[PDB]
Design a protein around this ligand. Structure first.
Ligand SMILES: [Mg+2]
Ligand SMILES: [Zn+2]
Ligand SMILES: [Zn+2]
Ligand SMILES: [Zn+2]
Lengths: 109, 80, 46, 303, 235, 205, 144, 151, 147, 574
RNA sequence: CUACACAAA
DNA sequence: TTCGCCGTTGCGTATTTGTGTAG
DNA sequence: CGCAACGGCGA
């Protein structure tokens, strides 16, 4: 006789992955930030300036959005952009890490 | 009492200040969360040290601005 | 629709070519009305 | 078609006899609105207006169902980091729009060499001011670009019903406009003859065209001069050909070398700003942009 | 126009003061059209003979907008009374009408006024606004009725009629003084809808050499595509 | 007619596949009378790797395309000769493509001879020079090394590419087998021609 | 001959109030008077003999089924047929279709009231030929 | 001068010797696919959608998107349920969101379907947010920069 | 004076009973919510609502917005926090204040993850589970940069 | 223990069996009573262990106050097994594929090996399998005929001897099936047919059946399950009493009506436009949003929307108080709800509680980490939306301009902005919501601003321009001749043309009051700020009017050279 | 909440 | 024996707004 | 109202 076990018992969750960072000279993605990427960088920075308060902006701004926009424009943003290229099925997450402070900023205005 | 490797994803409510000293803050947070409580068939006495971690990814599914970071760490546990 | 009148319909494909619907009222507006349907099927049967 | 005889057998309205032959019986209105239509003319006009209202009423539901189905069939198409379009990981396009460009960053410019004959191609674009084989190969490149454009779009004409060849194309950068603006803002005037300057300008335009497919990758691989994929080389074909047409020697005689350097960097900047963004839901954009003219196709059905 | 001619404000009923009607608008002033039709021999005309200037005036009447005279609004042009009703049943002997006692209560409304109540009802003529409580029903479980509307109202009529079981209920009538506001829809008899976009004082409105000035300024661009020549001829 | 076009374009197909003929090209009258009498016309060609490709052109009314027994017998006898037999190309009328008896015969003969490729095609696939059709962009097979380097640069798996049937007319004229890659130069009204690479999947039928 | 023009008013009739309320009354009456009283008479003739009951016994059985549980539901049923307009209403543990269609008298103005009382309703897809054709100005409309 | 026929018989026209067989244009996508292949069928889809669009049509890249979506598998798939089943059989949530959620759910349950969360409908139906747009690329904190600057 | 003579005269005009004071609506971040989905109620009559429909989500997705889909559809809607075990894929029981850390499935080997979801999606998954369809959420694997 | 941040990567769908229900269930339903006083009856279908729908009690299971409680399932041990309503067709397919005596696959299993796995079982059940001889036990397979009355009753017409296939019999038949048969039939291990018969069903969480009509069905099923004897056993051809037969049929029909009826079912909430998916998941009802009639405002920029002040005091912007913005946020806090611009709520960091400003007289202290909800002010970004949202520009971000007139309650916009939304001012209503989060505000400003939709994503061309009054006004201004003569104005009127342009006015110092300026001169003075080259015939010049009229030569060829309108009129073409 | 009706774009 | 046919079932038929009415 | 599986019975 057969009595079906629960689905959870036959469920193996997943293999944890290792971050494979593509070397800088082997990156093939754009060195210019997309409008999506620049917008997300400014949004994350502004929300973090809403929860924190520390910035490297000599000029004082009364809005976190202004501080974050100037940090992105003045190449002082403390964030990095990670572009996940491939998910190898041996357990490898292949990414390209891009520095926004060295990237081309889109028009955004 | 023996060393056991644990896997966890933390939550980082101030990612800017956390990243000023990632190792120290990570050890403090791990000791705070997993101090003398059962976790995965083990009592874990104290954190020996982190053996592998992740970049502090910013949370994507909420507008909180927080980061999480995955940390795989070693610790000594009290199995009976 | 007007009663005691025939409503021929070239309705459409379901093995029915044409139908004729007649609703008959004994002579008032409140008397029971019985409807007859006179189908003409593709098989030839009326 | 005219007003069909719907009133009775052979009758359009109670006002017109059976099998009437006059044009007014079938919806011909001899009056203007200012003159004021008669009663049957107003009935026919009301028939027309009601038909238009019904069309507007039902096209909404039909086009809405079509739009929802298209959205759900297309929404999974998202631009990835290679600017391909993929569903999850399965490729739908090798490059978005086959050129990797945002639809909001396109200008319609004319390709001058397309309709030019062999003689007028020499007269307008073959530069005879320096007895060099560099300009011979430049003119050969221009002629070959024209021939390739002609062959491709003549084939496109062949496998279509009435899709005529045109010399106007949507491109990310209007090179002619950039050259004209730099000419206008130039402090100097008619440049004196300078063989070194002309040769250097030709060489730098050739190098820029050779490195043009690197806008699709980055400046790192351009600096390292790594191989470019074939599809990326094809994606830059139209802009390469336009740059060769507009930045030819004959049209850039009065352009200084630093002015041409400014022109090339402006072109590259405008090209970089025209590429589709990573993660754009281009399937939803396509669904919206194709569903909008479906409403007008339904509305124009009665024509 | 057939559609718009039936939503036009006017004397919606001749016996309106004896009716507790809901969402009903009684417009004070009505005029016979200067160019009437036979329909006005059998039905009352709703509307006014506004002076309309077909002109471009600052681009505030484009795309079916209309510029109105603020003075024409102030004088009663299209002004009227909007009516709402509040009928609340007493269910059974458990519930009754009276001001709830805050000490006992059960479910007193937070932020509510609960004042302005006499014998359980707000008296006639009292302005009610947002959180004010109208008709205090108590079962003591609080079952009062809160106003809620963002537009203040004046209690027009209160009564306690006997339902079809010899039981009393509420049905108070609320009154709104509705002048012609910016954003109110106007239309001509030719079907030309318009939203009031700008109200100008009498000194800002254009005037003819003999002093005639419009009530509404209608864009000439509303005509050529819509072909509403009847309105033009009527003018 | 279908027979005349087939006769004039099957050798164009053979030469486009870079094959050399093993017999002499008979006149058209002899070809059609042989199809009517024997029931099929056999053409044998030699590939660059000395493999043998047999092209069977079956007549519309022949006995081999409506009785599965004769088709089984013919396939078994032709697959038992001492030849390399890189591929067997069976050409039938389009209605024969829907006959489950003949299709099942082809399936069992393929299973019994895994090394040999057996394909059954309709008449219209060889009734015209397929690569010369204006509507068909230029297909070309790329080697597994070039495909591997393309996929490695793109971080792609072969299953992530757009797919093309091995029974696709341009792929048939190319000779691409399932698992291969075909590069396509398609005209573009946005970019003035573009290059795409498609993964060849199992042939329909 | 052509088929029957489904939109022509040659073969159409407008029934309002009279016919509609009459049919509703017939349906409700057959369920709320005749059938209650039939059940009452069956009960009376079952749990009582015959040829011995007086004339008043029949009258008492008659009024038993009509002075109890009656005139408060048939009246209610007709009121429900007037108000609302949902297809089926409950009449003594059995539902019957509501054959009368009513709309609230919205007193936007006198013209709206008159037009609402002059509206002919055709209460029964959107992309068929029928859906387009039955919304058209038919050639039989003029004057009616 | 050419001949515009009613009905598509591409094969019959190629058999005819009085018309050019290499420039036969047929308005039907099925005949083009059966006779010419998937690339010619994709071009036919582009041409037919462009014909339907009219004078004021969209940019060509949207027609390209339509034609490449429908021909990505090597066969012409539709924008109906069947096309979604062919192109995204495992995307149970998207197919449920389109139509017939109970039938799709039943088939997913018996089929033991695994649904990777991608696109728009699948993340949305799980209360999540699509990984597109501003959230296509994930942001990580610059530990080196913050350590050396945000003391 | 205008250079052009202006056509001016009495044109009978009607005030249609569509009042902006009735039509206008503005709601704040709080109000009555649905018991089932946890979403705001429907419209002005219920004192809370206004719907961002399917097409609005399509438009915000085409714009690539997000973070506005997040705000509107989660923060200003029934957005909630789900807990998944990461070891069985089933919903877990987590409570920070009163300490509960468990899943009815594998107990000692519970790894509860904090998953941002909506109450509508939780109800949807509960309804698929009520129809005897087991929904197991795989959860993204943890990634580690090499030691 | 700080449940870490996670995202769902994949979702797997499986058939839930008795073991799944037993493991996942937090209670077993035993008693049919609903309530025990003010608290739900323990052991009933409303038991708090399965969630809380009221705020009077917590969940016991998770101790969450309704909003944070997602609900938990409970088991109902059924005295008689039931079939799974969702998989009746699967039960039917599995029944006419295996022998009902040993669970053997009496089917050419080797025949179905080339097929794709989902179609394998359907094809196998499409075979004859009637009167077929078995192999392991050598028995004749009866004909399984689906009952014509209900959706869940099966018969075994064995040579005319019809017998009911009760779900217990079906459970035994399916239990005899090996995993090898299920694998070779194209199903999975988790799709064994034994799962298709439910001994213990799952009582759904109270979160999905709140309010004390679907609960009536569950209560009916529970109370009718109590009637079945606990140890009822049925074998093939038992011929059980009619009473038990009616009870079993009613229980199974109750389960079928609970899951798949049409009270609305669990599965009937999913489909249709107003179902769970399309109404609750693919769309949403949202807070902090406004709607009003739109009217025209010529003095608003194309990227500006007029917001009535009453709506600006309803919708709020969440401003987290920090050192850099405390001085700017101080006026908002001090104004409160009394004067504009003010605020409505303050979130206290050290309290984790919001406080209304009207009741916040005793706080008067803003701390870093506090969240102030202030009124919408001029310059804020807002999302403007018109339905139906067909285009990418149907939702755009405009700069808020607050109309401080209390008599205005319309959403005013420039007439040239109407092309984004396909709007006009004949009664159209538009949704407007002001982003309050920092992330949404950043992205509204940087990504969804209406400057990004000036060029159509559809046609790649411009969307906005002069419409109606402005098109004919441009023509009138730039036309060469008026009926009064040359189209010239003196210096005062040339200056007055720029009064409301709202940019830096040009210089007229070189023009005397007596000087006359053409319309093209002032147009060029405007267009010089952004010099462009334009050369095209105007819409004014048509060949259908050429035989008539007298077209001025300077009007029928519009030319702009570096911002100078050399000649020609400006109209719809330009 | 489930109809239904009247309306708006 | 492999397919057409044919009832027979389900599924689906623009979006967002208001007001009622009743159950 | 239409569309499409479907699955059982005629070929
Ligand atoms: Mg409008
Ligand atoms: Zn678990
Ligand atoms: Zn709970
Ligand atoms: Zn057996």
């Amino acid at each position: 006789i057969v009595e079906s076990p629960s689905i959870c018992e036959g469920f193996v969750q997943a293999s944890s992955q290792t971050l494979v960072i593509i070397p800088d000279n082997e990156r093939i993605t754009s060195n210019v930030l997309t409008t999506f990427e620049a917008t997300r960088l400014v949004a994350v920075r502004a929300q973090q300036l809403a929860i924190n308060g520390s910035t490297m902006l000599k000029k004082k701004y009364s809005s976190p959005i202004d501080i974050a926009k100037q940090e992105l424009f003045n190449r002082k943003i403390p964030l990095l952009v990670m572009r996940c290229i491939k998910v190898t099925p041996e357990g490898q997450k292949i990414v390209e890490i891009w520095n926004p402070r060295e990237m081309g900023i889109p028009l955004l205005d | 009492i023996d060393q056991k490797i644990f896997e966890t994803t933390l939550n980082i409510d101030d990612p800017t200040n956390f990243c000023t000293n990632v190792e120290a803050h990570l050890l403090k947070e791990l000791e705070n969360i997993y101090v003398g409580k059962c976790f995965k068939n083990s009592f874990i006495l104290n954190i020996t040290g982190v053996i592998q971690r992740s970049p502090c990814f910013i949370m994507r599914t909420n507008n909180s601005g927080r980061g999480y970071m995955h940390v795989r760490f070693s610790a000594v546990v009290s199995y009976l | 629709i007007r009663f005691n009148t025939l409503h021929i319909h070239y309705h459409t494909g379901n093995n029915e070519i044409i139908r004729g619907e007649f609703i008959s009222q004994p002579g008032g507006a409140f008397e029971n009305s019985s409807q007859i349907i006179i189908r003409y099927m593709t098989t030839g049967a009326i | 078609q005219r007003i069909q005889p719907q009133f009775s057998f052979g009758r359009t309205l109670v006002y017109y006899p059976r099998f009437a032959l006059e044009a007014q019986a079938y919806g011909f209105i001899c009056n203007s609105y200012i003159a004021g239509l008669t009663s049957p003319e107003f009935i026919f006009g009301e028939m027309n207006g009601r038909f238009d209202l019904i069309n507007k009423a039902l096209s909404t539901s039909s086009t809405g169902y079509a739009n929802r189905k298209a959205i759900f069939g297309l929404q999974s198409c998202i631009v990835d980091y290679y600017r391909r379009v993929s569903i999850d990981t399965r490729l739908v396009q090798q490059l978005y729009g086959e050129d990797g460009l945002d639809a909001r960053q396109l200008e319609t410019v004319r390709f001058e060499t397309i309709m030019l004959s062999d003689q007028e191609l020499e007269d307008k674009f073959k530069y005879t001011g320096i007895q060099s084989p560099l300009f011979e190969e430049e003119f050969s490149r221009l002629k070959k670009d024209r021939d390739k454009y002609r062959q491709i779009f003549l084939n496109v004409e062949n496998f279509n019903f009435s899709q005529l060849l045109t010399d106007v194309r949507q491109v990310p950068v209007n090179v002619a406009s950039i050259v004209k603006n730099i000419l206008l803002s130039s402090t100097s005037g008619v440049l004196p003859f300078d063989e070194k300057s002309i040769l250097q300008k030709y060489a730098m335009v050739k190098t820029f065209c050779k490195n043009l497919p690197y806008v699709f990758i980055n400046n790192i691989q351009e600096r390292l001069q790594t191989p470019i994929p074939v599809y990326l080389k094809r994606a830059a074909s139209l802009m390469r050909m336009l740059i060769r047409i507009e930045l030819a020697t004959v049209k850039t005689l009065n352009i200084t070398c630093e002015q041409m350097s400014a022109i090339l960097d402006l072109i590259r900047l405008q090209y970089t700003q025209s590429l589709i963004n990573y993660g754009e839901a281009v399937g939803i954009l396509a669904a919206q942009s194709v569903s909008e003219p479906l409403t007008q196709y339904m509305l124009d059905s009665h024509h | 126009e057939t559609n718009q001619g039936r939503q036009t404000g006017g004397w919606y009923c001749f016996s309106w003061p004896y009716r507790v009607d809901m969402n009903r608008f009684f417009q004070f002033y009505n005029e016979m059209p200067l160019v009437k039709t036979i329909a006005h021999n059998y039905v009352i005309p709703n509307g006014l003979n506004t002076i309309v200037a077909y002109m471009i005036y600052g681009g505030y009447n484009q795309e079916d907008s209309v510029i109105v005279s603020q003075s024409f609004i102030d004088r009663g042009g299209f002004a009227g009374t909007f009516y709402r009703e509040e009928k609340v049943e007493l269910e059974s002997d458990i519930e009754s009408f009276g001001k709830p006692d805050p000490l006992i209560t059960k479910n007193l409304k937070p932020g509510a006024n609960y004042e302005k109540l006499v014998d359980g009802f707000v008296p006639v003529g009292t302005v009610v606004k947002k959180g004010d409580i109208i008709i205090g029903k108590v079962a003591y479980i609080d079952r009062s009725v809160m106003y809620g509307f963002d537009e203040p109202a004046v209690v027009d009529a209160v009564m306690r009629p006997h339902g079809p079981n010899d039981e009393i209920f509420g049905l108070m009538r609320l009154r709104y003084e509705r002048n012609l506001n910016i954003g109110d829809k106007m239309s001509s008899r030719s079907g030309n809808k318009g939203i009031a976009a700008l109200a100008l004082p009498t000194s800002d409105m254009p005037f003819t050499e003999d002093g005639l000035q419009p009530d509404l300024i209608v864009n000439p661009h509303s005509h050529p595509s819509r072909m509403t020549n009847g309105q033009m001829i009527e003018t | 007619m279908a027979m005349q076009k087939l006769f004039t374009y099957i050798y164009e197909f053979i030469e486009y596949r870079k094959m050399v003929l093993l017999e002499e090209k008979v006149p058209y009258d002899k070809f059609v009378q042989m199809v009517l009498n024997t029931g099929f016309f056999r053409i044998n060609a030699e590939t660059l790797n000395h493999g043998i490709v047999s092209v069977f052109i079956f007549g519309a009314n022949g006995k081999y395309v409506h009785h599965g027994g004769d088709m089984r017998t013919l396939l078994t006898n032709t697959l038992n000769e001492k030849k390399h037999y890189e591929e067997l190309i069976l050409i039938v009328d389009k209605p024969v493509l829907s006959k489950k008896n003949i299709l099942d015969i082809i399936v069992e003969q393929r299973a019994a001879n895994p090394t040999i490729v057996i394909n059954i095609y309709p008449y219209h696939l060889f009734c015209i020079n397929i690569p010369k059709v204006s509507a068909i962009p230029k297909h070309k097979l790329i080697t597994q090394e070039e495909a591997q380097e393309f996929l490695g640069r793109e971080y792609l798996q072969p299953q992530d590419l757009m797919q093309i049937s091995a029974s696709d007319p341009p792929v048939v004229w190319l000779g691409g087998r399932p698992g291969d890659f075909v590069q396509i130069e398609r005209p573009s009204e946005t970019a003035m021609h573009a290059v795409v690479i498609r993964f060849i999947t199992k042939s329909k039928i | 001959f052509p088929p029957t023009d489904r939109d022509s008013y040659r073969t159409k009739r407008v029934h309002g109030s009279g016919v509609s309320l009459a049919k509703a009354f017939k349906a409700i009456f057959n369920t709320s008077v005749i059938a209650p009283i039939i059940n009452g008479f069956k009960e009376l003739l079952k749990q009582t003999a015959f040829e011995e009951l007086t004339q008043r016994n029949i009258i008492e059985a008659f009024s038993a089924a009509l002075s109890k549980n009656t005139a408060s539901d048939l009246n209610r049923s007709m009121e429900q047929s007037i108000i609302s307009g949902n297809k089926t209403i409950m009449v003594r543990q059995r539902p019957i279709v509501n054959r009368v269609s009513t709309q609230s008298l919205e007193r936007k103005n006198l013209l709206n009231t008159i037009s609402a009382l002059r509206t002919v309703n055709t209460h029964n897809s959107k992309q068929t030929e029928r859906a387009d054709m039955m919304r058209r100005v038919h050639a039989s409309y003029p004057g009616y | 001068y050419a001949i515009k026929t009613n009905g598509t018989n591409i094969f019959g026209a190629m058999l005819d010797d009085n018309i050019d067989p290499y420039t036969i244009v047929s308005s039907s996508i099925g005949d083009t696919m059966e006779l010419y292949g998937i690339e010619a069928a994709r071009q036919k889809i582009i041409s037919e959608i462009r014909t339907v669009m009219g004078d004021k049509g969209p940019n060509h890249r949207h027609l390209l998107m339509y034609a490449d979506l429908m021909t990505r598998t090597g066969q012409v798939t539709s924008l109906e349920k069947a096309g979604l089943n062919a192109r995204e059989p495992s995307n149970v949530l998207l197919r449920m969101a389109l139509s017939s959620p109970v039938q799709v759910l039943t088939d997913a349950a018996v089929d033991s379907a695994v649904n990777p969360i991608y696109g728009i409908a699948a993340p949305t139906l799980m209360g999540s947010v699509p990984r597109i747009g501003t959230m296509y690329s994930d942001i990580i904190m610059d530990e080196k920069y913050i350590t050396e600057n945000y003391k | 004076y205008f250079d052009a003579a202006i056509f001016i005269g009495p044109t009978y005009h009607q005030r249609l009973q569509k009042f902006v004071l009735d039509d206008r609506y503005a709601v704040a971040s709080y109000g009555p919510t649905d018991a089932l989905t946890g979403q705001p109620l429907d419209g002005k009559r219920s004192h809370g609502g206004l719907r961002l429909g399917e097409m609005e989500h399509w438009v915000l997705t085409a714009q690539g917005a997000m973070q506005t889909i997040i705000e509107k559809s989660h923060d200003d809607s029934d957005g909630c926090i789900s807990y998944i075990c990461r070891n069985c894929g089933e919903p877990a029981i987590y409570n920070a204040s009163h300490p509960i850390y468990k899943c009815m499935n594998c107990d000692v080997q519970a790894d509860i993850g904090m998953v941002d979801s909506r109450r509508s999606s939780i109800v949807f998954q509960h309804e698929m589970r009520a129809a005897n369809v087991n929904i197991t959420s795989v959860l993204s694997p943890r990634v580690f940069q090499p030691a | 223990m700080e449940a870490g941040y996670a995202e769902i990567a994949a979702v797997q769908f499986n058939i839930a069996g008795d073991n799944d229900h037993k493991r996942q269930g937090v209670m077993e339903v035993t008693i049919s009573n609903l309530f025990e006083g003010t608290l739900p009856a323990e052991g009933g279908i409303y038991d708090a262990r399965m969630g809380t729908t009221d705020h009077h009690y917590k969940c016991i299971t998770c101790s969450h106050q309704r909003k944070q409680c997602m609900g938990h399932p409970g088991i109902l041990q059924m005295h008689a097994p039931v079939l799974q309503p969702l998989f009746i067709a699967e039960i039917r397919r599995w029944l006419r594929v295996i022998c009902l005596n040993c669970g053997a696959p009496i089917v050419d299993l080797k025949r179905y090996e080339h097929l794709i796995r989902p179609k394998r079982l359907i094809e196998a059940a499409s075979s004859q399998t009637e009167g077929k001889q078995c192999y392991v036990c050598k028995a004749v397979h009866p004909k399984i005929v689906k009952d014509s009355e209900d959706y869940f009753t099966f018969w075994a017409d064995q040579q005319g001897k019809i017998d009911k296939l009760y779900p217990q019999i079906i459970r035994e038949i399916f239990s005899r099936v090996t995993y090898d048969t299920v694998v070779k039939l194209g199903r999975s291990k988790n799709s064994h047919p034994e799962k298709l018969v439910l001994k213990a069903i799952q009582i759904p969480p109270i979160s999905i059946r709140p309010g004390i009509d679907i609960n009536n069905v569950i209560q009916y099923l529970v109370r009718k399950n109590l009637l079945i004897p606990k140890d009822l056993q049925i074998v093939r051809g038992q011929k059980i009493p009619l009473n038990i037969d009616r009870n079993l049929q009613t229980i199974q029909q109750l389960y079928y009506n609970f899951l798949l009826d049409s009270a609305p079912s669990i599965m009937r909430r999913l489909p249709r436009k107003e179902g769970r998916i399309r109404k609750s998941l693919l769309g949403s009802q949202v807070w902090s949003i406004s709607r009003s009639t739109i009217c025209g405002n010529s003095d608003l920029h194309l990227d500006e929307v007029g917001y009535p002040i009453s709506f600006a005091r309803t919708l709020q912007v969440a401003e987290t108080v920090q050192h850099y913005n405390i001085n700017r946020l101080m006026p908002y806090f001090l104004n409160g709800k009394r004067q504009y611009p003010g605020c409505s709520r303050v979130y206290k960091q050290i309290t984790q509680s919001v406080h209304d400003i009207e009741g916040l007289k005793q706080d008067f202290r803003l701390e870093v980490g506090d969240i102030l909800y202030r009124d919408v002010v001029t310059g804020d970004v807002a999302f403007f939306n018109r339905q139906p949202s067909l285009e990418r520009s149907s939702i755009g971000v405009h700069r808020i301009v607050v109309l401080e007139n209390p008599k205005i309650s319309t959403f005013q916009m420039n007439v040239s902005a109407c092309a984004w939304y396909n709007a006009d001012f004949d009664g159209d209503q538009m949704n407007l919501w002001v982003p309050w989060s920092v992330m949404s505000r950043v992205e509204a400003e940087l990504l969804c601003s209406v400057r990004n939709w000036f060029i159509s994503t559809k046609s790649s061309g411009p969307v906005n321009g002069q419409v109606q009054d402005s098109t004919v006004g441009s023509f009138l201004l730039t036309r060469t001749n008026t009926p009064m003569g040359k189209n010239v104005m003196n210096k005062l009127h040339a200056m007055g043309l720029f009064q409301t342009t709202q940019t830096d006015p040009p210089c007229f110092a070189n023009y005397s009051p007596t000087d006359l300026l053409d319309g093209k001169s002032v147009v060029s003075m405007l267009l010089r700020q952004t010099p462009i080259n334009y050369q095209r015939a105007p819409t004014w010049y048509s060949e259908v009017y050429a035989p008539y009229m007298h077209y001025n030569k300077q009007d029928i060829s519009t030319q702009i050279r570096n911002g100078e309108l050399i000649e020609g009129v400006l109209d719809k073409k330009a």
